[PDB]
Scaffold this motif. Structure first.
Motif, PDB file in Angstrom:
ATOM      1  N   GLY A 269       0.838  -1.184   0.000  1.00 53.04           N
ATOM      2  CA  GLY A 269       0.000   0.000   0.000  1.00 53.04           C
ATOM      3  C   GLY A 269       0.878   1.239   0.000  1.00 53.04           C
ATOM      4  O   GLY A 269       1.866   1.302   0.728  1.00 53.04           O
ATOM      5  N   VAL A 270       0.525   2.218  -0.826  1.00 49.43           N
ATOM      6  CA  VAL A 270       1.284   3.451  -0.918  1.00 49.43           C
ATOM      7  C   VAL A 270       0.298   4.596  -0.750  1.00 49.43           C
ATOM      8  O   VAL A 270      -0.625   4.748  -1.545  1.00 49.43           O
ATOM      9  CB  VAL A 270       1.976   3.573  -2.295  1.00 49.43           C
ATOM     10  N   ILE A 271       0.490   5.406   0.280  1.00 46.60           N
ATOM     11  CA  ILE A 271      -0.428   6.505   0.522  1.00 46.60           C
ATOM     12  C   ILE A 271       0.068   7.847   0.015  1.00 46.60           C
ATOM     13  O   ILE A 271       1.081   8.369   0.485  1.00 46.60           O
ATOM     14  CB  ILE A 271      -0.760   6.638   2.034  1.00 46.60           C
ATOM     15  N   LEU A 272      -0.665   8.402  -0.943  1.00 50.29           N
ATOM     16  CA  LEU A 272      -0.322   9.684  -1.510  1.00 50.29           C
ATOM     17  C   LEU A 272      -1.219  10.760  -0.925  1.00 50.29           C
ATOM     18  O   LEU A 272      -2.327  10.475  -0.469  1.00 50.29           O
ATOM     19  CB  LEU A 272      -0.440   9.624  -3.033  1.00 50.29           C
ATOM     20  N   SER A 273      -0.751  12.003  -0.959  1.00 43.33           N
ATOM     21  CA  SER A 273      -1.495  13.124  -0.396  1.00 43.33           C
ATOM     22  C   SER A 273      -1.619  14.317  -1.325  1.00 43.33           C
ATOM     23  O   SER A 273      -1.891  15.434  -0.866  1.00 43.33           O
ATOM     24  CB  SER A 273      -0.796  13.582   0.868  1.00 43.33           C
ATOM     25  N   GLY A 274      -1.424  14.093  -2.619  1.00 44.29           N
ATOM     26  CA  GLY A 274      -1.492  15.184  -3.580  1.00 44.29           C
ATOM     27  C   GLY A 274      -0.385  15.015  -4.604  1.00 44.29           C
ATOM     28  O   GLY A 274       0.230  13.951  -4.672  1.00 44.29           O
ATOM     29  N   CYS A 275      -0.107  16.046  -5.398  1.00 42.56           N
ATOM     30  CA  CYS A 275       0.925  15.916  -6.412  1.00 42.56           C
ATOM     31  C   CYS A 275       1.942  17.038  -6.411  1.00 42.56           C
ATOM     32  O   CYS A 275       1.878  17.925  -7.251  1.00 42.56           O
ATOM     33  CB  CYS A 275       0.276  15.825  -7.785  1.00 42.56           C
ATOM     34  N   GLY A 276       2.879  16.992  -5.472  1.00 43.79           N
ATOM     35  CA  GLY A 276       3.891  18.029  -5.383  1.00 43.79           C
ATOM     36  C   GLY A 276       4.307  18.332  -3.957  1.00 43.79           C
ATOM     37  O   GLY A 276       3.472  18.371  -3.062  1.00 43.79           O
ATOM     38  N   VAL A 277       5.603  18.551  -3.746  1.00 45.70           N
ATOM     39  CA  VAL A 277       6.162  18.855  -2.431  1.00 45.70           C
ATOM     40  C   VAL A 277       5.297  19.694  -1.481  1.00 45.70           C
ATOM     41  O   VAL A 277       4.897  19.232  -0.414  1.00 45.70           O
ATOM     42  CB  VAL A 277       7.483  19.603  -2.564  1.00 45.70           C
ATOM     43  N   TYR A 278       5.029  20.933  -1.865  1.00 45.00           N
ATOM     44  CA  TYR A 278       4.261  21.843  -1.025  1.00 45.00           C
ATOM     45  C   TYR A 278       2.772  21.523  -0.875  1.00 45.00           C
ATOM     46  O   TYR A 278       2.196  21.706   0.189  1.00 45.00           O
ATOM     47  CB  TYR A 278       4.426  23.276  -1.551  1.00 45.00           C
ATOM     48  N   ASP A 279       2.151  21.050  -1.945  1.00 47.57           N
ATOM     49  CA  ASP A 279       0.726  20.739  -1.945  1.00 47.57           C
ATOM     50  C   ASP A 279       0.344  19.366  -1.445  1.00 47.57           C
ATOM     51  O   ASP A 279      -0.695  19.205  -0.808  1.00 47.57           O
ATOM     52  CB  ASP A 279       0.161  20.877  -3.356  1.00 47.57           C
ATOM     53  N   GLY A 280       1.156  18.371  -1.787  1.00 43.95           N
ATOM     54  CA  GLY A 280       0.855  17.014  -1.401  1.00 43.95           C
ATOM     55  C   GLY A 280       2.073  16.139  -1.352  1.00 43.95           C
ATOM     56  O   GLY A 280       3.050  16.486  -0.693  1.00 43.95           O
ATOM     57  N   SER A 281       2.029  15.016  -2.061  1.00 43.77           N
ATOM     58  CA  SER A 281       3.147  14.071  -2.071  1.00 43.77           C
ATOM     59  C   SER A 281       4.371  14.559  -2.810  1.00 43.77           C
ATOM     60  O   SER A 281       4.250  15.141  -3.865  1.00 43.77           O
ATOM     61  CB  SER A 281       2.711  12.753  -2.701  1.00 43.77           C
TER      62      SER A 281
END
Lengths: 221, 219
Positions: free
Chosen positions: B6-18
């Motif tokens: 399982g890989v948990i992502l939180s968005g697309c980019g350093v400041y905004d998410g993953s």
């Protein structure tokens, strides 16, 4: 340290630069001890696609702004890219290479490449600097240069046709290998054109970067 | 080989998410190691949207799941649908999104709260002896996910390590190219861009982390 220009066209397969391809390219440049110098045209993206659905979104996004996410802000406008300051040039894939760096996605054989990208590309070739295009990006080559080139987009017969019909010698190529036009120092590789997983894609991208780098030095002479 | 990670992502980019590098590098190691990545992201609006060129916030909205999907070419699912029983391990790449969207550590620091689902999933995993891997700033959530002390890292930043120890955790200074493991609770952590100066460095540690999570995943 050699400066390798990397042209991004957004942040994501459908909208701009293929994130895997871009990061994998940057990793190879870095593992190979070279220095990546990223650029992206400062203009609005042709579209904004929901990568979960595939459907277009009713919103706007700037190519440069978004590409910056891939580079942690270490990126500059395509305009500011000076061929004299780069030892080579790599263009990762993604549909953005066909929408924002050109309109190959629409006009196909009748497409037009981005002014600056074309100019930069030519200045590079004209100075003997190596070029690396991957995934669908190679489709621009026939429009950037008038003379025939040996390139690949994988094995897709349909696309290869369009490329040959654009004045290019297409060479079928596997995910894990690359094609090189020795004379014009142009390397290309099938990425997600054929890749089934990221490991496969890394396979070819690594070979591409290593070859571009080899050609880059050997030219530094 | 074929094991679901399982890989948990939180968005697309350093400041905004993953952190895009950390995420892609994680996926590459899972793949080179013959395992199968299964990506998730909470289906909710991002806390903010940052212009990665400037650093300034943008007056617009973006959905964590929607954006994280860019990193996975659409191969991603809502965090809610993640079932511990179907995963052999869990990895959480870094990026400020791990501190804004998977928790609010960026704001409440020691008083932060982790995402409900993430915490639940994380515990279910540990409770079943499945290995966990957190990197970059992500480890800061561990002290809030588990009540018992854990051995972890966020690199060498004294200031952050303080906050973590003050949260009931044994922080272990760690170099970019190495990892820290809480043998008992099967929890691996690595400083990524917390210390990384280039992507190669970051890959160095992330690879070690994934290899160890995979090794521990063998029961």
């Amino acid at each position: 340290m050699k400066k390798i220009g990397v042209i991004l066209s957004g942040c994501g397969v459908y909208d701009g630069s293929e994130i895997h391809e871009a990061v994998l390219t940057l990793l190879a440049i870095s593992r190979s001890g070279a220095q990546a110098v990223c650029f992206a045209p400062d203009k609005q993206q042709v579209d904004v696609i929901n990568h979960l659905t595939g459907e277009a979104m009713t919103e706007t996004r700037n190519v440069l702004i978004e590409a910056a996410r891939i580079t942690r802000g270490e990126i500059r406008p395509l305009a500011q890219a000076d061929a004299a300051e780069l030892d080579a040039l790599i263009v990762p894939g993604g549909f953005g290479a066909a929408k924002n760096l050109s309109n190959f996605a629409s006009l196909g054989s009748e497409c037009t490449v981005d002014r600056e990208l074309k100019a930069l590309a030519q200045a590079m070739h004209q100075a003997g600097k190596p070029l690396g295009f991957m995934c669908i990006a190679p489709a621009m080559l026939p429009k950037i240069f008038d003379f025939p080139l040996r390139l690949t987009i994988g094995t897709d017969i349909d696309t290869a046709e369009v490329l040959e019909e654009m004045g290019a010698e297409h060479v079928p190529c596997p995910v894990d290998d690359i094609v090189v036009d020795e004379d014009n120092k142009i390397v290309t590789t099938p990425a997600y054109m054929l890749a089934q997983n990221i490991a496969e894609a890394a396979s070819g991208i690594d070979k591409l970067v290593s070859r571009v780098l080899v050609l880059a030095e050997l030219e530094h002479h």
